[PDB]
């Protein structure tokens, strides 16, 4: 009952860069890469978990960040499975990947190589409300 | 209940009775239930 990433009703993405429109996540040529999680590691570099919604994620060259609107030089990409960290380069849409390193990434950014529209998502999340003070030392 | 040496009807239901030759007060207010009046 839980079908392909094209039969599922695709989630909407309102890119903060001026394209807040209704778009689909069907598998096609254009590529969008959203880093939905990050983790820290000094030795191997930061381990950022990303979701591939469409297209292929290129590596070995300068990858464009539309949110930062700049090209960043990357060295290696990875995927942390349930019990391993396989050093990889590409994951297709409907699946999840990671970058080992990439110390400048945010939840909602769009890594592109085919120059797809923007999908910066920040409104779908809400505030942790109720405050507890922290004093300085 | 708790052991005492003098029962006082501090509640309206404090019936001074003798169960097993132990003089106690039986009442709805379990706070006021005592023994050995």
């Amino acid at each position: 009952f839980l079908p392909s990433p094209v039969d599922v009703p695709q989630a909407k993405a309102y890119g903060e860069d001026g394209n807040e429109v209704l778009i689909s996540a069907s598998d096609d040529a254009p590529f969008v890469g959203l880093a939905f999680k990050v983790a820290t590691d000094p030795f191997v570099g930061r381990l950022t978990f990303v979701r591939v919604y469409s297209g292929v994620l290129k590596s070995g060259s300068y990858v464009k960040n539309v949110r930062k609107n700049k090209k960043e030089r990357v060295s290696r990409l990875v995927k942390m499975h349930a019990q391993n960290r396989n050093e990889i380069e590409e994951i297709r849409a409907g699946d999840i990947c990671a970058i080992i390193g990439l110390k400048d990434t945010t939840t909602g950014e769009t890594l592109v190589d085919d120059k797809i529209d923007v999908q910066l998502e920040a409104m779908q999340f809400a505030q942790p409300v109720i405050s507890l003070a922290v004093e300085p030392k | 209940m708790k052991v005492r040496a003098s029962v006082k009807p501090i509640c309206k239901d404090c019936k001074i009775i003798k169960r097993h030759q132990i003089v106690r007060v039986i009442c709805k207010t379990q706070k006021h239930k005592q023994r050995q009046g």
Partner: protein
């Protein structure tokens, strides 16, 4: 303690006259210290937010939240009805707000939830203000 001195008026009253000197910035420092001493001796009062709560609790802890806010001394003049929840238009102090969600949840399984709107700043009660006066 460096709290913002806002919403306060300052009034000049009088100065002095002199011929052979008594120049300007001497008057500047005199006025500055006069304002500072008046601020010192004012025995001030403070402002905190006491926010009107839009309590959106499902109708199984509506009475529990009602009693909780009554213990928190709120202004529940009524309760509007909804689909499965009741919304109480109450008031809660920010001091009793600290852990209000946590305490309400610990008393109501966590389903008794909270909707909190920011209200205009109001005079601190006599208990809260006097602990800060120094």
């Amino acid at each position: 303690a460096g709290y913002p001195m806002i919403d306060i008026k300052a009034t000049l009253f009088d100065g002095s006259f002199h011929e052979v000197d008594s120049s300007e910035m001497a008057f500047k420092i005199a006025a500055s210290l006069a304002l500072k001493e008046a601020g010192k001796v004012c025995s001030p009062v403070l402002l905190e937010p006491i926010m009107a709560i839009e309590v959106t609790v499902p109708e199984q802890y509506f009475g529990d939240t009602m009693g909780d806010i009554s213990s928190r001394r709120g202004l529940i003049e009524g309760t509007e009805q909804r689909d499965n929840v009741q919304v109480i238009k109450a008031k809660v102090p920010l001091k009793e707000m600290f852990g209000y969600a946590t305490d309400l949840r610990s008393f109501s399984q966590g389903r008794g939830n909270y909707v909190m709107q920011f209200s205009h700043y109001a005079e601190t009660p006599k208990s809260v203000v006097n602990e800060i006066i120094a």
